[PDB]
Design a protein around this ligand. Structure first.
Ligand SMILES: CCCCCCCCCCCCCCCCCC(=O)OC[C@H](CO[C@@H]1O[C@H](CO[C@H]2O[C@H](CO)[C@H](O)[C@H](O)[C@H]2O)[C@H](O)[C@H](O)[C@H]1O)OC(=O)CCCCCCCCCCCCCCCCC
Ligand code: CLA
Ligand code: CLA
Ligand code: CLA
Ligand code: CLA
Ligand code: CLA
Ligand code: CLA
Ligand SMILES: CC1=C(/C=C/C(C)=C/C=C/C(C)=C/C=C/C=C(C)/C=C/C=C(C)/C=C/C2=C(C)CCCC2(C)C)C(C)(C)CCC1
Ligand SMILES: CC1=C(/C=C/C(C)=C/C=C/C(C)=C/C=C/C=C(C)/C=C/C=C(C)/C=C/C2=C(C)CCCC2(C)C)C(C)(C)CCC1
Ligand SMILES: CC1=C(/C=C/C(C)=C/C=C/C(C)=C/C=C/C=C(C)/C=C/C=C(C)/C=C/C2=C(C)CCCC2(C)C)C(C)(C)CCC1
Ligand SMILES: CC1=C(/C=C/C(C)=C/C=C/C(C)=C/C=C/C=C(C)/C=C/C=C(C)/C=C/C2=C(C)CCCC2(C)C)C(C)(C)CCC1
Ligand SMILES: CCCCCCCS[C@@H]1O[C@H](CO)[C@@H](O)[C@H](O)[C@H]1O
Ligand SMILES: [Ca+2]
Ligand SMILES: [Cl-]
Ligand SMILES: [Cl-]
Ligand SMILES: [Fe+2]
Ligand SMILES: [Mg+2]
Lengths: 38, 29, 81, 334, 342, 34, 62, 37, 451
């Protein structure tokens, strides 16, 4: 409801990890399926 | 393949878990 | 400050996450299904991997007339059997 | 005071119209030699067999060139990385045929410019300044080293160093694209972000400061007379400039701290150009741009071209045409 | 005077997180549609029917190779409106015909207008001189000359730049091979303005940061500045001596220094724009006539200029059949230009 | 104390809403095979 | 022996993970330091022993 | 290949080399927790 | 939280490690923990390579950089560099990984639990950066340690199996070195050689006897120097030449490491003795020369007289003269005539490449090797598509020589930048103006005008 209950450093850490996961997936896709040259 | 991801999940969480545990216990961060 | 609630307040509040823990995955799953059901191909008219060429054809279906371009595209599409 | 002490005091003196200093002691003769040789060669040097195939290329004004086409031409492929000073040649005519001036000039120049960097450190110290202007100058300097020394080392010949001329520079770029696909290399891409970005922020800062100049003059005089050299007060209103730019985008996308702002102005082009230089320096050892040739394939296995493949056709044109008499075997391996 | 117009003006000019303004009415939808159009195209939309290329994430392209490509050469300079005579209201066909290209170019142009109007509007509200907008005239001249005037001079929108990373790289290489664009003195002035601007950015930031006054106790010196302070945060006098002794000359007037920082990159970009206007008509700086007469007569005469032309000829012959599919080029192997072995 | 639905809220969602949808779509694409 | 090997190695990995999290937490935690310290000694000695056990048993399974 | 007795740890071995990078990121998690003071 | 914020320490979070300059215990921790990270990487990366290692494929086809380092030392390989036993690689990997736990343990302890400063705890381990003698003593300890390391290489070569020798008579093989070069004219001779073409400074070292003897010299020099620095204190002239502070010493080391990085770049690019082509792939020069060899062999089999064949330019199509007359391969590879490699040397006579040997003595293994090297040239894209820039996707290859060279050029360059940064800063701080100009004491204001 009001700001502060979930510490910003946790939000940042989880957000950032999410970014890493999704970009990681996109790099995986460069080597498999469409666009992989195989 | 799922195994690799599981490993990096546990390993990857180890670092933030230490900070979290210390924060909760008011440790010397 | 210009009056709006500070972002740092918002994204650290419980209610924000009660809302967005639902709305964010829901949007993500909707986009997934847009691709996974094949709807995207039909909406934008993008070729599936088996629809760039007919079996023995090796020439691009290039649009060559301005005002009957639409019908040309349709003819190209029919020729994929 | 003895003569050596007096000499030292003059060399390191803060009162000389142009600072000399110990780095300057090496810088001055080396730059003078490169400059004088460059001018004489650019005007009067005969053709140079750049590719070591007895096919001399004319670079000087007197031998049929204008300002755009003229160059001092790289030393012969037959020489490779061998050191070729005047005294290694049987004669000056030989020295010139083989491209000796190129080596004399680039070596004296790289040494002299390195010393120019050192000298920036040194004067900063004599004046009680902070020391890092020289770090900013490391970015263009590293770039010079990349095209004149590192690329030749990696490829095995000063014949592949950048020619000292306008069209020769273009030649270097086109062959580089054929051989390394530099446009698709992320370090060159960071380089471009660095120079486009540098120009953008240059214009932006120029415009914001100019926009917030405090009124000190009348309409019939240049507003520049509103600033006096060494006045203690700032000449523009940073609070107003920030009010403006902050509302142009949003408040927290604008700098309110002049120091952070100026550090940003330094760091953005310097870092980007560092990567430009590292690009050339690593493509020197043939770690090349991204290769997506035939990356996209349909269900049967037909190649579906992307823009990458069109780039590839362009690069093939460059490759098959460059140095048209110098390759005897199917692969261009340096 | 407090009618609906003035009430609206009040609301439009509220001091909120994202300022709107009258200019916002033009700027926000147009910028949004341009960006959204690009993201939409590069994610989902092909270039198979206009170029014979895959161009979207959906087909397997990556961030470097995706694009919203130009329409087929047969479209000419059609506005290619969705309700126009080519697509006839059909959204799918419109995408297949390259309608997103003109969608993005046109909404992009009107959005740039909106943004420059925003610069004027805000400057006026805040009470500053409008040099930021003026400086923005250079981005405008580049966009209009490259994405509009240039293809308008050529056969069709097909030859405009396609909106994509690799697509733009292709544009550069096309200009080298066909226009000898590096030879053009307007491009050269553009280059000097861009590199000179980058130089000025670097040297000015670095100089300020290395002639700071000590205005605090910290070894990290950023906190020792206050936005409201009257004093210069660095010494112009010391900066002047340093540069006078290092380079021979130095700025002494801060107002002139910052004006020059506007002047250099803005003028460079304007000059490049002029060269591109000539290239719209194939009015190139392609050759030096004296060079060609000499080389034609004398098979031992060689310069870097003639060497580059052979590279251009390679580019043209090797890239044209696939880059210009509407021409149906068939160049037999025996006619392709090639040096020994390669 | 604070309003919820503002001009800022609107701009924020006009960007964030399609972004997440597009990210799910591109994610799915990574598992497509010719 | 293979069982003994595999289990000793599993023990080494598990214990390593436990130490990796627990040692810095103990070092930086205000209270319960004596018990913590005893536990860190114990964990260390056991860790060393397990490394030695895996090392020796390696040659009776490979 | 590792010796057969160790084969079950293959997924683990695949992940190990990146761990040092995790230490650099951890410094930022830590600094965020103390407000970058 | 002693000294752990910007207000007390004077340093912002992004320069947080500068807060450690005068806190020797914690700094000791940072250092030991960092060493742990290094050793960790060596072990983990070795196990990763081994897991991904197919013994019948060349190493260089598999993206390996550490296994080559181990094999060069003579572990795990036999004639021609064939892998006969992978167990040594496993051992190196495991032992490094286990050691990294120990180092990390020490590092973490000293960094967050142990005494923050060491001076009150121990006169031996405590230090003042400005204490010149203490600095020279610790420098000495470390010199003795390095010397011991060099001698450990000597011991491997002479008493524990030998080294892989690409040049061994009869074909590459592991060989025991029994007669290391001790003659200082040879050893320091390398040091005085030009770094330009055909000379190549120390990078030209081309036999294991010289490598080993060189390491004997370096071992003894390092131990002697260490003793010297323990037993002495800096002379007047040194005291007057240097800045004596932590940041200054750091800057000196940064310059030294930059230099070493550039050198290692050249070593891995040109040298094929201590970086055997069997393990690292052919050098750029090597692969170019190999192409020339390959087509000479093909065309001569077809009946060509390769000695007299005139190319389009007038130079020999296959063979020509170097600027000093030696017979060398033609085409663009004329640039690479300084190349030397065991597959090529048997065709070399006093005047260079010998036409009689070329006509009669080329063996099938030479043809094979030249074909292999020609088709594994160190060219390839960032996404590891092997070959020239215009090559199509098919071959997953970028030479380890390229990976090593490029990485170490980048690192050496940024380390030069770091040297400039920290050297300039150390000067400014020692003199007292690293935080900016004193408004009431601006030096330029007391100087006469330039005009
Ligand atoms: C304080 C410091 C002192 C400063 C004062 C200045 C000192 C003098 C200036 C030196 C400049 C040297 C330039 C030439 C570098 C070069 O051609 O280096 C190449 C040489 C190696 O030479 C090669 O070495 C080879 C040796 O291999 C031979 O031996 C082998 C044995 O296995 C093989 O058989 C092989 O096939 C065979 O050919 C051959 O001789 C080649 O012909 C030969 O070209 O490297 C080497 O000597 C060692 C590596 C040198 C370092 C590389 C320079 C990098 C500098 C970048 C600076 C950036 C600055 C940015 C500013 C901001
Ligand atoms: C508000 C800013 C704005 C601006 C300046 C533009 C501008 C444009 N749009 Mg975009 N558009 C916008 C917002 C905007 N749009 C929004 C919010 C959407 C989402 C709904 C779109 C969705 C969209 C699509 C799908 C397309 C465009 C297209 C265009 C282009 C052609 C438009 C045209 O011919 O209109 C003509 C109409 C006018 C100029 C209105 C003038 C009104 C006059 C002055 C008053 C008199 C009207 C009269 C009384 C009505 C009588 C009608 C009766 C006779 C039948 C033009 C570049 C086309 C395009 O890009 O093709 C490549 C296109 O296909 N737009
Ligand atoms: C090689 C990487 C490295 C290392 C070894 C260090 C080391 C150090 N830093 Mg530095 N730092 C680094 C990178 C590094 N830093 C980076 C990249 C940044 C920018 C984000 C900083 C920014 C920074 C600031 C602003 C400060 C430091 C400080 C410190 C010191 C004390 C930190 C503290 O009190 O933590 C308290 C932290 C905790 C209690 C949380 C747990 C920390 C432990 C060590 C993690 C252990 C995890 C590991 C997996 C366990 C294995 C155990 C196993 C072997 C049994 C310490 C010596 C501080 C200092 O100088 O103090 C005087 C300080 O103020 N650092
Ligand atoms: C000396 C450094 C070095 C070198 C030469 C190599 C070389 C190699 N590695 Mg190894 N590796 C390294 C360090 C190194 N690695 C580190 C630190 C890790 C831990 C992350 C690993 C973990 C690792 C794994 C898991 C794998 C490899 C693999 C490989 C091979 C393929 C590499 C590739 O495709 O890169 C792709 C290219 C990049 C990722 C580009 C990196 C660009 C960086 C970010 C630029 C940074 C610039 C500079 C450092 C920043 C300065 C900032 C400035 C502002 C100051 C190649 C032989 C692969 C292999 O084939 O194994 C058999 C493989 O699977 N490596
Ligand atoms: C950079 C290396 C280094 C240095 C200079 C120090 C220095 C110190 N340590 Mg630390 N420490 C280190 C690494 C280091 N340590 C490591 C790796 C660990 C994990 C084992 C520790 C764990 C540790 C603990 C738990 C404690 C210390 C303590 C101390 C202090 C007292 C030491 C003493 O009296 O030993 C006396 C010397 C000996 C008993 C002989 C040592 C025999 C050595 C180890 C044989 C091997 C030597 C050989 C060269 C090793 C080469 C390794 C190479 C391959 C990397 C002293 C300041 C104490 C302290 O600070 O109390 C307040 C303390 O309680 N250290
Ligand atoms: C003079 C220093 C020196 C040099 C030139 C070499 C050279 C070599 N070493 Mg050796 N080595 C050394 C010292 C040196 N080493 C030391 C101190 C150790 C113990 C750590 C070793 C332990 C060792 C091992 C275990 C192995 C080697 C191997 C090699 C070979 C391949 C590695 C390489 O490319 O390094 C390039 C070398 C450098 C970049 C260092 C350059 C040093 C410069 C010239 C001097 C710097 C001086 C300094 C800045 C001055 C201080 C200030 C002073 C004036 C007051 C190569 C011939 C490998 C080998 O031979 O395989 C068969 C191998 O396996 N070395
Ligand atoms: C890491 C290794 C290391 C470091 C950092 C030091 C550091 C120092 N040494 Mg020590 N030393 C070492 C190893 C080291 N030493 C070894 C291994 C030996 C045995 C050979 C010695 C024997 C020794 C003696 C006999 C003396 C020193 C002295 C010193 C002090 C001043 C040196 C100086 O002015 O350098 C800078 C060098 C100079 C000013 C000399 C000339 C400079 C020219 C430009 C060198 C040109 C080199 C150039 C780059 C070419 C490189 C390639 C070339 C070799 C072919 C300084 C504390 C002096 C001292 O004060 O002792 C108490 C001193 O008298 N050292
Ligand atoms: C060898 C081995 C081992 C080891 C391990 C280890 C040693 C680990 C470590 C680990 C770690 C060490 C981890 C860490 C992690 C970290 C992370 C995961 C982070 C992330 C981060 C982020 C994401 C960030 C974010 C942010 C922030 C925070 C702020 C600013 C902004 C940003 C967003 C950037 C074990 C036990 C397994 C056993 C077996 C073997
Ligand atoms: C066209 C059209 C239209 C419109 C549409 C729209 C408006 C859309 C939008 C759209 C959108 C709005 C989308 C979005 C997207 C996004 C995305 C897709 C993102 C991604 C991201 C990422 C991927 C990230 C990355 C990164 C970076 C950037 C940096 C840092 C690092 C990283 C890597 C993280 C209409 C209907 C009107 C009409 C018809 C036509
Ligand atoms: C101070 C500090 C820091 C840092 C830290 C560090 C850097 C640490 C390190 C640490 C370390 C450096 C650690 C390590 C560890 C390791 C370990 C724990 C290992 C274990 C191993 C194992 C367990 C093995 C196993 C095995 C075997 C035996 C056989 C084969 C397979 C396998 C692999 C499974 C930071 C930045 C955070 C910030 C704050 C302060
Ligand atoms: C192992 C080996 C070897 C050997 C090696 C050796 C024996 C080495 C030596 C080395 C050396 C023996 C080195 C040295 C170095 C030195 C240096 C690097 C120096 C530096 C200096 C400086 C840096 C100075 C500076 C300054 C000046 C100039 C002025 C005044 C101030 C000052 C002081 C700052 C060989 C090759 C046989 C083979 C392989 C193996
Ligand atoms: C262009 C705007 C034209 C406004 S029109 C104008 O509008 C006023 C209210 O705004 C009315 O009170 C007035 O009668 C009317 O003439
Ligand atoms: Ca299929
Ligand atoms: Cl050419
Ligand atoms: Cl050739
Ligand atoms: Fe400024
Ligand atoms: Mg894919």
């Amino acid at each position: 409801s009001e700001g502060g209950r979930i510490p910003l450093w946790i939000v940042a850490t989880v957000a950032g990890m999410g970014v890493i996961v999704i970009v990681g997936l996109f790099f995986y896709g460069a080597y498999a399926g469409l666009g992989s040259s195989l | 393949v799922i195994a690799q991801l599981t490993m990096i999940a546990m390993i990857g969480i180890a670092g933030p878990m230490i900070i979290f545990l210390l924060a909760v216990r008011r440790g010397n961060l | 400050t210009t009056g709006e609630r500070p972002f740092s307040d918002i994204i650290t509040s419980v209610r924000y996450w009660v809302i967005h823990s639902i709305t964010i995955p829901a949007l993500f799953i909707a986009g997934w299904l847009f691709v996974s059901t094949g709807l995207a191909y039909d909406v934008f008219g993008t070729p599936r991997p088996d629809s760039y060429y007919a079996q023995e054809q090796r020439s691009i279906p290039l649009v060559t007339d301005r005002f009957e371009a639409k019908q040309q595209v349709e003819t190209f599409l029919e020729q994929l059997k | 005071a003895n003569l050596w002490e007096r000499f030292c005091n003059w060399v390191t003196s803060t009162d000389n119209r142009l600072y000399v200093g110990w780095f300057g002691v090496i810088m001055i003769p080396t730059l003078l030699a490169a400059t004088i040789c460059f001018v004489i060669a650019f005007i009067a040097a005969p053709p140079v067999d750049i590719d070591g195939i007895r096919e001399p290329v004319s670079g000087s004004l007197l031998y049929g060139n204008n300002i755009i086409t003229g160059a001092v031409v790289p030393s012969s492929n037959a020489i490779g990385l061998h050191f070729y000073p005047i005294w290694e040649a049987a004669s000056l005519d030989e020295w010139l045929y083989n491209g000796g001036p190129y080596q004399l000039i680039i070596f004296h120049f790289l040494l002299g410019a390195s010393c120019y960097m050192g000298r920036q450190w040194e004067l900063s110290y004599r004046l009680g300044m902070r020391p890092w202007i020289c770090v900013a100058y490391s970015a263009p300097l590293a770039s010079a080293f990349a095209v004149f020394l590192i690329y030749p080392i990696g490829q095995g010949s000063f014949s592949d160093g950048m020619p000292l001329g306008i069209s020769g520079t273009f030649n270097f770029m086109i062959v580089f694209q054929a051989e390394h696909n530099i446009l698709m290399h992320p370090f060159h891409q960071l380089g471009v972000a660095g120079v486009f970005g540098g120009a953008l922020f240059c214009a932006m800062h120029g415009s914001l400061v100019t926009s917030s100049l405090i009124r000190e003059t009348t309409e019939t005089e240049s507003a520049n007379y509103g600033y006096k050299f060494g006045q203690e007060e700032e000449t523009y209103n940073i609070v107003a400039a920030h009010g403006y730019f902050g509302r142009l985008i949003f408040q927290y996308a604008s700098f309110n701290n002049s120091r952070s702002l100026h550090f940003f102005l330094a760091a953005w082009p310097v870092v980007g150009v560092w990567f430009a230089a590292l690009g050339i320096s690593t493509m020197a050892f043939n770690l090349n741009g991204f290769n997506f040739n035939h990356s996209v394939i349909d269900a049967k296995g037909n190649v579906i071209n992307t823009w990458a493949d069109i780039i590839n056709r362009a690069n093939l044109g460059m490759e098959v045409m460059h140095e048209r008499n110098a390759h005897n075997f199917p692969l261009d391996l340096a | 005077e407090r009618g609906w117009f003035d009430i609206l003006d009040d609301w439009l000019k509220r001091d909120r997180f994202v300022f709107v303004g009258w200019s916002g009415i033009l700027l926000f939808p147009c910028a949004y549609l341009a960006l959204g159009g690009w993201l939409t195209g590069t994610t989902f939309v092909t270039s198979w029917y206009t170029h014979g290329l895959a161009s979207s994430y959906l087909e397997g392209c990556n961030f470097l190779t995706v694009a919203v490509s130009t329409p087929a050469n047969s479209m000419g300079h059609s506005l290619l409106l969705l309700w126009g005579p080519e697509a006839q209201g059909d959204f799918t066909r419109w995408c297949q015909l390259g309608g997103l290209w003109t969608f993005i170019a046109l909404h992009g142009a009107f959005g740039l207008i909106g943004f420059m109007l925003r610069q004027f509007e805000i400057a006026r509200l805040v009470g500053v001189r409008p040099y930021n907008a003026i400086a923005f005239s250079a981005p405008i001249a580049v966009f209009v000359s490259v994405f509009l005037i240039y293809p308008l001079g050529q056969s069709s929108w097909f030859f405009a730049p396609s909106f994509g990373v690799a697509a733009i790289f292709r544009f550069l290489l096309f200009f080298q091979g066909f226009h000898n664009w590096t030879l053009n003195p307007f491009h050269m002035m553009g280059v000097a303005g861009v590199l000179g601007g980058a130089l000025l950015c670097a040297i000015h930031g670095a100089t300020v940061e290395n002639t700071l006054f000590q205005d605090g106790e910290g070894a990290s010196t950023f906190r020792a500045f206050n936005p409201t302070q009257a004093e210069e945060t660095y010494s112009m006098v010391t900066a002047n001596r340093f540069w006078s002794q290092i380079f021979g000359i130095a700025f002494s007037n801060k107002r002139w220094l910052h004006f020059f920082m506007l002047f250099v990159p803005v003028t460079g970009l304007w000059m490049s724009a002029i060269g591109v206007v000539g290239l719209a008509l194939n009015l190139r700086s392609y050759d030096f006539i004296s060079q060609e007469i000499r080389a034609a007569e004398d098979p031992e005469f060689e310069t870097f200029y003639t060497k580059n032309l052979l590279l251009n000829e390679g580019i043209r012959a090797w890239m044209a059949p696939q880059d210009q599919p509407h021409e149906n080029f068939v160049f037999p192997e025996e006619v392709l230009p090639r040096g020994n072995a390669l | 104390s604070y309003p919820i639905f503002t001009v800022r809220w609107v701009a924020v969602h006009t960007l964030a809403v399609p972004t997440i949808f597009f990210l799910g779509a591109i994610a799915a694409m990574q598992f497509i095979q010719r | 022996m293979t069982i003994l090997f595999q289990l000793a190695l599993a023990a080494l990995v598990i214990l390593s993970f436990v130490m990796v999290i627990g040692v810095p937490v103990a070092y930086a935690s205000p209270q319960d330091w004596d018990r913590s310290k005893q536990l860190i000694f114990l964990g260390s000695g056991l860790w060393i022993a397990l490394v030695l056990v895996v090392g020796v048993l390696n040659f009776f399974v490979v | 290949k590792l010796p057969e007795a160790y084969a079950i740890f293959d997924p683990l071995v695949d992940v190990l080399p990146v761990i040092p990078v995790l230490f650099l990121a951890l410094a930022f998690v830590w600094q965020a927790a103390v407000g970058f003071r | 939280a002693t000294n752990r914020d910007q207000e007390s320490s004077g340093f912002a979070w992004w320069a947080g490690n500068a807060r450690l300059i005068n806190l020797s215990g914690k700094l000791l921790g940072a250092h030991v923990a960092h060493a742990g990270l290094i050793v960790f990487w060596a072990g983990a990366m070795t196990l990763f390579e081994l897991a991904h290692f197919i013994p019948e494929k060349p190493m260089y086809e598999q993206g390996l950089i550490l296994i080559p380092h181990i094999a060069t030392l003579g572990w795990g390989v036999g004639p021609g560099g064939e892998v006969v036993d992978t167990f040594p690689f496993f051992v190196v990997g495991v032992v490094h990984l286990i050691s990294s736990a120990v180092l990390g343990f020490g590092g973490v302890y000293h960094a967050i639990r142990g005494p923050e400063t060491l001076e009150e705890y121990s006169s031996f381990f405590g230090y003042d950066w400005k204490d010149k003698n203490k600095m020279t003593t610790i420098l000495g300890f470390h010199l003795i340690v390095l010397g011991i390391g060099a001698l450990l290489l000597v011991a491997k070569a002479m008493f524990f199996g030998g080294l892989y020798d690409t040049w061994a008579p009869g074909g590459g093989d592991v060989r025991v070195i029994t007669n290391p070069t001790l003659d200082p004219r040879v050893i320091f001779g390398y040091l005085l050689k030009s770094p330009f073409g055909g000379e190549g400074w120390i990078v030209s070292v081309n036999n294991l006897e010289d490598v080993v003897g060189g390491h004997i010299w370096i071992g003894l020099i390092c131990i002697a120097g260490g003793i010297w620095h323990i037993l002495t204190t800096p002379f007047g002239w040194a005291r007057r030449a240097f800045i004596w502070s932590g940041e200054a010493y750091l800057s000196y080391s940064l310059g030294a490491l930059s230099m070493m990085g550039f050198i290692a770049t050249c070593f891995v690019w040109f040298n094929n003795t201590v970086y055997p082509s069997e393990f690292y792939g052919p050098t750029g020069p090597e692969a170019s020369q190999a192409q020339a060899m390959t087509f000479l062999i093909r065309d001569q089999k077809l009946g060509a007289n390769v000695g007299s064949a005139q190319g389009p330019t007038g130079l020999g199509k296959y063979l020509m003269r170097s600027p000093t007359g030696e017979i060398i391969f033609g085409g663009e590879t004329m640039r690479f005539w300084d190349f030397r490699g065991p597959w090529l040397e048997p065709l070399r006579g006093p005047n260079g490449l010998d036409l009689n040997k070329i006509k009669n003595d080329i063996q099938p293994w030479q043809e094979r090797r030249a074909a292999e090297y020609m088709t594994h040239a160190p060219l390839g894209s960032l996404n590891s598509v092997g070959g020239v820039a215009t090559e199509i996707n098919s071959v997953n290859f970028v030479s380890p020589r390229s990976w090593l060279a490029t990485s170490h050029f980048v690192l050496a360059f940024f380390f030069l930048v770091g040297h400039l940064w920290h050297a300039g800063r150390a000067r400014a701080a020692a003199a007292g103006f690293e935080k900016g100009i004193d408004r009431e004491s601006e030096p330029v204001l007391s100087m006469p005008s330039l005009d």
